[PDB]
């Protein structure tokens, strides 16, 4: 609040989590599910919706 | 707008003609199947 | 009488809320009561 | 005569009123037992399928 | 001091009180296990769920559909563990509905949601939510779209607060504060909320400080049985509606069925047409326009008996 | 003289020719048997069938329908025998179709229709039909809104022949006179239509004398499949469309699917869910707009196995 | 066509045969059914839909 | 309109004791099994 | 060439007409070959 | 430098285009499998159970 420009600044950090959470979220899942689950599938398999 | 009279005639001719013409086609089927089979004979 | 119980019910400004009410009323005894067992199970 | 009329009148409306609400009745009726009563009569009877096999063990 | 604390404590749980759970779910057994509202839909609906693994949970979803309101496709990704829970969901026309919920505690966890349209389109909605679950009580409190950037807080707040008073009886609270502009002044609103739940039947009720009453009672009729009356009150003219329904549960199928006084009824059939295909037909018709909407899905679910070894998560913070 | 007669006749016949059905049975196999066109529906369905007797055949009908252009109730009678079939069935609107036909000779049949709105709405169709068969050929002349009141021949006049070329050759003749309004000239259309039948496929073509042209190929694959395709040009702009289907008859379901040049897709499933009940699952797919339209219809046969002593009355003109 | 008055009465006739199709048809269809079926059914059973 | 500068300070005002009164129902509910339970004991 | 072939199915007065036709050809071959009973029976 | 961006905004156009056919052809594709073979796999699956209590006989 301190300074109106502060203000803009996190106003900048908003959008700017907005794209990562927008693009980021599900490959970050993804990423959960493929490197942690057990066993490990295969890369097409992991999204492949009946094989 | 409406057809005048003589418009009239001219288009109840051309149905009339039609009209004879697809019982002259009808006629010509009904005897199509002799003029077929005799085709078929002389192969 | 029965008048002041019909208009209530269907031509006044909360008939609405009485025909839930009452309709709550009944489904709830129905189901308390046992009658919804000895029919529906 | 026109007081036969107006009876007739009185009658006429008022049973078409009637047959329409008979009518409209009998229909909803009639549709609720056969969407609630198809569904159910179907897995009600598969399940009955599914018992008898378990009878016999 | 612990003098008082000890005393205190030890007569608390001499009461046998139990965690009487969320608010939402004061009613989640009419309005959610028997009635049909949460299941009905019109038109054509296909779910491709892919399970890779129970422990911890990691599956992907495809939803295909044609109908009212329903996106073209719906790509979901969900990862769950004992002690945290991701799932996304993103729409054809890339709206994305984020979930993660983690337990700080056995007894706190956090849950955090985001709605995240196009940019030009819709608005984008943040929401953090606090649990509590304590011996006998909940306690919870979400902050959606909370702003101080204008100098003042900004936001929808919401309390809950559902607490054990008897084995059986358990009453609640919930507050809410809104200042979505600072120009405008904050609005408040706080409803009361009651539930009796016995073995055979379960008795709620929520009201709104405004007017408006939704009660509810569920009964289970028999083993395979049970059903339920929701009864919604509103008086912002009045207008009220009341909703019967039951939810019979067969071994290969469940069916659920609900008249309501506005004339409106609707079945749902959920059948088991084969190990992993689970068809339903859902059917909606209201009386007084006759008019009818059908709807038919399916769900499959690929993972069959491939990962059977593995066992679900405990707990996870679904 | 009959001496002629006597040689003509004789020679006809050598020739080993049969009926070949009506013109408008033309590509039954493919538009009828195969595709779905008929059979699609919207909303929900159920039609309740009570046969009382099978020689004379007598049954009852009622259908409940909510859906697209459906009315919201039907009551239907019919009576059939040898010589005679009348059918009758009335909406709940009032409008009430009617059928009537009556075997004058075993070659010759009279057919009637009547359509009759409610008296100010609508307009009253009267349609009169008189079929021939012959040994190897078919005559058919309807009249529809015939009138002389005003002093000359008003109305639609159809003319229809169809001509066993060889065994397998069928070629035939559509003609139509109209003149609705006698101060308006009448207008004439032939439309030319032809089917080469075998025993395993069949192709057919309609060709209006205006440029329509229709053609139409179907094939059986083997003892329980088929398969058509049905071509429509337009050339009134120029349009054109190509349906392509099959039909699989399994032992209790039979299962339609049709797919066109307009990216419509659409499927018909029947199935004997049990002995007297019939269900009927519709599903039609717009490619283009993403748009399904579900239809689930009912059927139920009451009469069942109490009249089986009796066998349906041999050819009924239905 | 004779007389124009003929052409109202014409008129009239269709008008009258209009009713009694459109009342009487449904009734003669039942009525030859139930009368001629073989066995007669019951009045009621006539119109039940699946009794 | 827009409220005036003493509307908000009397919108703020009945807001914050609204929720004041909420955190007090809590206080009591929390409390309320004790006292529940008690009357049972007379019983 | 090829652009002679693409105009005048999709992008031409006759366009549609051009797709139905084609697509009967190739419906047809196809059932007549045996192609669709050795695919769909 | 301009040359890069028209470039880019050339490819970014065309390949959001690309994607938006691939992905609805996709859709098209998969929905019609479902809608046929869904249908198709349960009727012709219980086909095969009624030709299994055919061959015990
Ligand atoms: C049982 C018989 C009771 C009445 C049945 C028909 C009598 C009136 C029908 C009528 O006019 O239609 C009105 C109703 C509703 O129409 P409506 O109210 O929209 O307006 C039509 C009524 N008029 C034109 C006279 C104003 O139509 C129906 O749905 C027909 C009734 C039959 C429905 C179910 C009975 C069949 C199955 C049971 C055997
Ligand atoms: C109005 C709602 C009901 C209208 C439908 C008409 C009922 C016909 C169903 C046929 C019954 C049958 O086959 O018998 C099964 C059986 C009859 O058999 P049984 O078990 O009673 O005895 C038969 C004897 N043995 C076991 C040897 C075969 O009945 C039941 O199981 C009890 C349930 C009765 C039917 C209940 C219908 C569905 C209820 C859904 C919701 C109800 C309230 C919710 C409100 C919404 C509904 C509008
Ligand atoms: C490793 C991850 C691989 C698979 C995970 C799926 C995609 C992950 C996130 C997608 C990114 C978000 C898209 C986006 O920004 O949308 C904005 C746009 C909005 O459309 P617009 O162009 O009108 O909006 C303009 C706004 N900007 C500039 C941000 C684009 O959405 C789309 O691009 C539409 C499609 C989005 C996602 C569709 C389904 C998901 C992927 C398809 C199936 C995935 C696997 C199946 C095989
Ligand atoms: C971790 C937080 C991530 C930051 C942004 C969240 C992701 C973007 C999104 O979906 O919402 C953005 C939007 C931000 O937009 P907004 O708040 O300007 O208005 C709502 C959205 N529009 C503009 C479309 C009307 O969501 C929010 O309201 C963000 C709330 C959290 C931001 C800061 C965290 C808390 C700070 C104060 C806490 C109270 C003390
Ligand atoms: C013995 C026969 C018993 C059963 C046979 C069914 C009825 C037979 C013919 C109905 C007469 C025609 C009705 C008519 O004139 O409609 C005009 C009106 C048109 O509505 P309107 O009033 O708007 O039009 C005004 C025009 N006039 C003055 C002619 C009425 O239609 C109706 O009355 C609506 C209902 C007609 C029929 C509805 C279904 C048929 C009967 C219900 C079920 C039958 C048995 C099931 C139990
Ligand atoms: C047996 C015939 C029964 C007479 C009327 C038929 C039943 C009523 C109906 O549905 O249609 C009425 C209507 C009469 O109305 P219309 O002909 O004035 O116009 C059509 C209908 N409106 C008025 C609504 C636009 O149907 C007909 O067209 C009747 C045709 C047959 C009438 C006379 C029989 C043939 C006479 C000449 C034959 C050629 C030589
Ligand atoms: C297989 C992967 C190929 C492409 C899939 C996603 C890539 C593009 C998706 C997209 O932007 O949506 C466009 C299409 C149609 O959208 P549209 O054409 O209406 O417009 C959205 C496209 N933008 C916003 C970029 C202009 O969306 C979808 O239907 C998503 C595609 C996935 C459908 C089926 C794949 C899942 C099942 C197979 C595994
Ligand atoms: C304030 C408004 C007026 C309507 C209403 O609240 C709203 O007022 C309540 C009064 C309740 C009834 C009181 C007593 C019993 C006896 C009980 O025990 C019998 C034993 C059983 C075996 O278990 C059968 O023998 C059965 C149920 C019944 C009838 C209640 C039903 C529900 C009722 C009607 C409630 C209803 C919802
Ligand atoms: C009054 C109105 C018309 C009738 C109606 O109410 C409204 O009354 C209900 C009676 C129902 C039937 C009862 C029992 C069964 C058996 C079940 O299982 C058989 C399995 C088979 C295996 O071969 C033999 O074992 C199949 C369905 C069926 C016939 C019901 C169909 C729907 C019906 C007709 C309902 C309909 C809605
Ligand atoms: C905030 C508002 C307060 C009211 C409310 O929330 C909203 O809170 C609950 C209080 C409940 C009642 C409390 C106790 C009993 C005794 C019980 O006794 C059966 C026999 C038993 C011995 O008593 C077995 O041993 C019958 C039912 C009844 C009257 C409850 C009915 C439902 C009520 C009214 C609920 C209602 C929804
Ligand atoms: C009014 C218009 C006239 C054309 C038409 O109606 C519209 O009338 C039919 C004439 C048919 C053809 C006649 C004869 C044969 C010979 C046959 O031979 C196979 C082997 C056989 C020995 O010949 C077995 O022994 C192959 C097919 C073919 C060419 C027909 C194709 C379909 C045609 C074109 C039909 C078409 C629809
Ligand atoms: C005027 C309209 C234009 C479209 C159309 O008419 C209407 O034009 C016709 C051409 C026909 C095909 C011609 C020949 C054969 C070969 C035969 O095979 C026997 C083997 C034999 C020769 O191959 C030697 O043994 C099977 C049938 C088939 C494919 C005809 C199918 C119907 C077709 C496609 C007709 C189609 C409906
Ligand atoms: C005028 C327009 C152009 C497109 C078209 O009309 C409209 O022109 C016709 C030409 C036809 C083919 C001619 C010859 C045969 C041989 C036959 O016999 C093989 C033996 C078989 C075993 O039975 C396999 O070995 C198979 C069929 C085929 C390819 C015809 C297919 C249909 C076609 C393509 C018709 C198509 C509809
Ligand atoms: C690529 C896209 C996703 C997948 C898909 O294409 C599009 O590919 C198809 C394969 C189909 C399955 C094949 C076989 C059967 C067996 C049948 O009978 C079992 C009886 C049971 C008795 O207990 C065991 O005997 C039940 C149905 C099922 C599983 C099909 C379901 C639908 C599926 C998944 C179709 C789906 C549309």
């Keep these: ?51 | 707008p409406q057809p005048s009279p003589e418009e009239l005639r001219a288009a109840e001719a051309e149905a009339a003609s039609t009209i004879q013409r697809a019982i002259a086609t009808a006629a010509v089927l009904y005897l199509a199947p002799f003029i077929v089979d005799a085709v078929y004979k002389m192969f | 009488p029965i008048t002041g119980a019909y208009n209530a019910l269907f031509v006044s400004e909360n008939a609405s809320i009485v025909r839930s009410v009452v309709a709550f009323g009944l489904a709830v005894t129905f189901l308390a009561s046992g009658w919804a067992e000895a029919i529906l199970s | 005569r026109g007081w036969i009329y107006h009876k007739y009148e009185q009658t006429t409306s008022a049973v078409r009123k009637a047959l329409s609400f008979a009518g409209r009745a009998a229909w909803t009726v009639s549709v609720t037992a056969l969407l609630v009563g198809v569904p159910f009569s179907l897995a009600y009877g598969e399940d009955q399928q599914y018992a008898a096999m378990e009878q016999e063990q | 001091l612990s003098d008082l604390y000890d005393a205190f404590q030890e007569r608390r749980q001499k009461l046998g009180l139990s965690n009487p759970g969320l608010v939402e779910n004061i009613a989640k057994e009419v309005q959610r296990d028997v009635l049909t509202t949460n299941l009905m839909f019109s038109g054509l609906r296909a779910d491709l769920t892919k399970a890779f693994s129970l422990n911890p949970l990691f599956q992907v979803s495809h939803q295909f559909a044609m109908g009212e309101r329903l996106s073209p496709y719906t790509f979901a990704a969900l990862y769950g563990t004992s002690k945290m829970f991701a799932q996304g969901n993103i729409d054809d026309q890339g709206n994305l509905s984020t979930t993660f919920n983690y337990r700080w505690t056995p007894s706190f966890t956090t849950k955090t949601r985001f709605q995240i349209t196009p940019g030009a389109t819709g608005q984008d909605m943040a929401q953090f939510e606090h649990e509590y679950s304590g011996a006998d009580f909940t306690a919870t409190i979400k902050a959606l779209n909370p702003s101080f950037l204008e100098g003042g807080l900004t936001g929808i707040f919401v309390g809950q607060y559902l607490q054990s008073i008897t084995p059986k009886l358990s009453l609640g609270l919930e507050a809410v504060w809104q200042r979505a502009g600072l120009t405008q002044g904050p609005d408040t609103a706080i409803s009361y909320v009651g539930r009796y739940k016995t073995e055979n039947w379960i008795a709620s009720a929520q009201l709104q400080a405004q007017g408006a009453l939704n009660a509810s009672y569920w009964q289970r009729l028999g083993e395979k049985v049970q059903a339920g009356v929701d009864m919604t009150l509103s008086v912002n003219t009045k207008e009220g509606i009341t909703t019967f329904g039951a939810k019979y549960d067969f071994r290969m199928s469940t069916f659920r069925a609900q008249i309501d006084t506005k004339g409106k009824l609707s079945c749902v059939l959920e059948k088991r047409v084969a190990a992993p295909v689970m068809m339903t037909f859902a059917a909606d018709v209201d009386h007084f326009t006759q008019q009818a909407k059908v709807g038919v899905g399916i769900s499959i679910e690929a993972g069959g008996e491939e990962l059977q070894d593995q066992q679900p998560a405990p707990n996870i913070p679904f």
Tied chains: 1, 7.
């Design chain 1, 1 to 51: 609040l301190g300074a109106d420009s502060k203000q803009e600044r996190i106003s900048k950090l908003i959008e700017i989590s907005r794209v990562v959470i927008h693009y980021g979220y599900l490959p970050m899942i993804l990423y959960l599910g493929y490197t942690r689950s057990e066993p490990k599938p295969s890369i097409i398999r992991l999204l492949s919706p009946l094989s």
